Amino acid sequence: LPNITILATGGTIAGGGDSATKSSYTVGKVGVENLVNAVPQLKDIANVKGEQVVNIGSQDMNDNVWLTLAKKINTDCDKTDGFVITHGTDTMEETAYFLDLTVKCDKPVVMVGAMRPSTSMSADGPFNLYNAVVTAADKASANRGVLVVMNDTVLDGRDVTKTNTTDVATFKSVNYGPLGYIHNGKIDYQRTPARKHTSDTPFDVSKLNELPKVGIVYNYANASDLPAKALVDAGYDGIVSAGVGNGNLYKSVFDTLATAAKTGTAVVRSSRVPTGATTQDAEVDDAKYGFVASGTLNPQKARVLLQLALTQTKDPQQIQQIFNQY
Amino acid sequence: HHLPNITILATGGTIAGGKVGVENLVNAVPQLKDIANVKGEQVVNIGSQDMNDNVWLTLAKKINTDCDKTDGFVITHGTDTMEETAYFLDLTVKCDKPVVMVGAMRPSTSMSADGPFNLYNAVVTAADKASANRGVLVVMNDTVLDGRDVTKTNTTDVATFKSVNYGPLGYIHNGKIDYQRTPARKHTSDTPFDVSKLNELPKVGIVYNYANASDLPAKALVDAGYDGIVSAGVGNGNLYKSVFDTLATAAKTGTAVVRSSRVPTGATTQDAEVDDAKYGFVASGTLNPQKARVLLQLALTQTKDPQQIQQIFNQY
Amino acid sequence: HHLPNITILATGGTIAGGKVGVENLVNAVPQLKDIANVKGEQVVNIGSQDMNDNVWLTLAKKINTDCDKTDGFVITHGTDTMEETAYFLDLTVKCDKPVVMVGAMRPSTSMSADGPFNLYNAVVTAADKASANRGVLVVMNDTVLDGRDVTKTNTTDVATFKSVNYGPLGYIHNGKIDYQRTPARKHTSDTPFDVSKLNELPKVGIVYNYANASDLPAKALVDAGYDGIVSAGVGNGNLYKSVFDTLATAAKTGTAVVRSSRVPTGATTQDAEVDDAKYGFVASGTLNPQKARVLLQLALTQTKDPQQIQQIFNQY
Amino acid sequence: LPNITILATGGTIAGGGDSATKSSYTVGKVGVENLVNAVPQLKDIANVKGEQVVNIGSQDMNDNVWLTLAKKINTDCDKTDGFVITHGTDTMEETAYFLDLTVKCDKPVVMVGAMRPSTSMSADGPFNLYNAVVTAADKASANRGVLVVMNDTVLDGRDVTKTNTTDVATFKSVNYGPLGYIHNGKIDYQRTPARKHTSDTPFDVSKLNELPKVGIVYNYANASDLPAKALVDAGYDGIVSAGVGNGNLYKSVFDTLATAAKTGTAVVRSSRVPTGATTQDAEVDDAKYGFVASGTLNPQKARVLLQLALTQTKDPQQIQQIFNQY
């Protein structure tokens, strides 16, 4: 059986409530050893080793944990056959894309969480963890980038997003679809992401203590420019706009970001709209303003790539090329 | 043989690209005369990414004032913020006659432009007696959508508008609608919100949550004396710790705080990970951040008390 | 403090895998006693791929007879044909108290089995006074779905059941339902269908359309004297020429013919490519083939006239 | 500009009504030359040549037209840079998969239709045809199998299906997602089908006058076995079951197909359920009965592959292997 390493970071998968039928609970309580022992069927498919990296709710996920995870996977690659990262669902789509761009280990790296606490009736954690280990143990899972496995489905770290606040089926790759489905412990892979990932990217965080500062501002009717101005006044390296429609901006926000771009702030136009690309050649002349269009990357995913782009370059044309390749 | 009188109120948008006038918009679809007596009025001519409180107030007052002068309204509008205007009017229009919003995802000069048939179907909907008393509506891609749940789901697709939590009210085929649903949430004349004499709306901003989120946007809204802040939370309305800290302080120093979610479907519920009663927060339910802002502004015209705002978010 | 009386009628399905008894099903979820006084009765114990007219008649008669002896019903059922049983009961149950169907997509012995919480939520729904007068319901994956529109959309997903044309009625969180919709189509006590004295239902079969489709299935149903045939058409109810020829003959020689569609969402409409009045055909609207069969069988207990059947397909 | 050949077969894209605002129309009236002249923007992107193969509604599509199309594309491959097939929407998903398995030409083959007649207000035909030609002209479209292009989206011929009876956005690849989106005449491809297609299949129809007979029977409550018996009595080479749930069958239908399989009839279990695979190792012991599980192929798609499988073999184990590879 393959050796599989579980790196635990917290989340509702490790959470507990006082009743199996009531919704209130606290995240990231139980340890990695309890999650493993809760699924004795794991011993049929893998030799599982658990390590507790942190124990937080992923609403509190941060740069420091991301750097810890990437360095640990890259350091321990030769010591195991694959990785499973247990994680909160709230920002799993962000961590998955970060690791998708920075992990250099060729072996499967699979993220997994649970929408229901471990104590709940029909808790989804146990089978999710089982299927995550199935995926990390599958030879065919290698070289597909960092993966998220939820609700019997293998999803690429770039397109995967949380589509619903409570549904166990919440995780979907809403633009390009899943890579494969899991049935009876086997996967029929019919897709693989074409965008460059893992060892095909230039992003190398092995020696980094911190990441460039990138914030996100929302657009809506009558939007205040004060959030954007606050990020500019703090000297943020980049700002992602969650625009309306095809990456459009309320005039006040547009005006502030255009002025900041001329001072050197990197500005990426994304969209609050949950599917579809923020394109070039629509209503915003990105070349004129020095802006970058995010494509299908939603605002929090665009932040991930912008932070890493800014470890390499501050030039908008080069950043746009990065947003066209990764 | 007499046809209903339908008033088109034009605000801009790609359906008017907003540069072409409301008379040009009407004459482009001569078949409108087969179904309605159409009169057009230009309210503004803007891209809806620049929609604002003043235009919202103008539209609600115009519809309420002119209700008895027409049989139904169509509002032509940009698609980017149509879902916000639709819900604002859903809460403030007191005319029970049909009010239908419509836009276009493709330019009027483009191949297979969707604007012409979109407008035709919007007039069909405003002219159907069955459309009355269903709240303010959005009509796009042969579908009638309630103004509360409707949202733009895709950046470019002509089929982008969907009521993603509770579904559409009816589909349009051959100029006829089979309505199978109506919104249960209280709208129009069943709400207490009355903007007839207001020149401005309470100030409500939106902050985004994500890994490592800065508290600076939330702090800037607080420093500016904002009346309310809507959080686009992660998952089920959850907050990054720094943002949580700032909003907890704001809620105990006057500011109304509504937890919504950046997640595109599903409710932000009570009784999950955040003790709303302890912090004086309000949970937005299925209202996404920009919709929650609409209701929070109007709630703040009535009350600043968090329990009373929560009740408003449970009824409208 | 008193809790509602809820009767569980068991028919089989993976939620009972149908091999385990109804008492075993109940005792597996002890928290049921926190929300209801539960009594279980075994009606049949079959896989729902073998569901049939006799079980449908038994269930409708049992619910109608026992209505005044309980406060609500839960029917445990296989997922494969739950959407058909749900609509049959939707049309024939005259009890206005909640009737909720539920199943499970994973075996009860499997990791993260969905059956236990599914049953809990089904009892929550049957015990909610707000669930009355909404027709027969299906409760799956924290969602309340009307029996007319609900359908199985995926072969394995625990989230498979969706009301794909008009959306759900409400979502369940923390044991509470926020209902925002109700079906406008006439159901239960608002239909004329009365099976109380029937031992059998009119014979209605379904034929599939595709490229090069054989007319032999349609011919075999005609040769057997079927009372009606539902066509799973291509696109908007269209028929392969050979199948069209056979059904046109059948419609003029007694047989009721309903055009539905193999396409999983959207209505089969009148006034498209098929002149239904010329051929004596009925268009099924949003009813998929197996749902259209349910309504056609019941229509044929009232009338054989195509215009009157079309009216039934426009009202129920 | 590339040379693009339009092969016309009919459909609503070629249909016309007496009014732009009323829904009634007739299919396959106007000729290929009228469709081309209706889109003068095509001359900006390609040298277009039209040929009328047939002019039918695709509800009347049949084996003979399929064989004509495959032979024509394979014969004329060297004479053009890519193919667009205008087609009715009702069975486009069937023809696309047939050509996906039998076309040996390496150059892009793109199918396209229209949900609204050419005479209708906001008719979708003109822009659909434009985007189909864009796709056939794109070098990156080659080697992705036969494609369907509808509503700004490039879809693989295997997974693409018509999901709605009237919506212009009806065509979706409901299990694995689209291959790319089209904006401003350009495609960002992020996926390609892993299942073997075109020149990687053994199916060679170049000398065939006819195809094996395969019919489809529906399952539902109280289902009659008479449709299945009628196909068996006619000596059908194969029968596809549109089963309930995960490919399950009503007992009467099961009994008839099991008896037929022992006489040599090929029996494929598919599902009337619109998404998801009909799997092995669920409730039906396929090996015991000699049945084949269709995977994600819906009943009409499973018929296509079964017909072609039956040109090579009647052995259920070999047919199952075909259903696992193509």
Ligand SMILES: N[C@@H](CC(=O)O)C(=O)O
């Ligand atoms: N609050 C949790 C949500 C979850 O795990 O589902 C987290 O992200 O850690």
Ligand SMILES: N[C@@H](CC(=O)O)C(=O)O
């Ligand atoms: N920018 C435009 C988008 C559209 O009309 O579709 C607007 O909202 O006004």
Ligand SMILES: N[C@@H](CC(=O)O)C(=O)O
């Ligand atoms: N074959 C089963 C499927 C299920 O229960 O999910 C049935 O319908 O009875």
Ligand SMILES: N[C@@H](CC(=O)O)C(=O)O
């Ligand atoms: N009946 C038409 C439908 C369409 O083209 O949309 C056909 O398949 O030819």
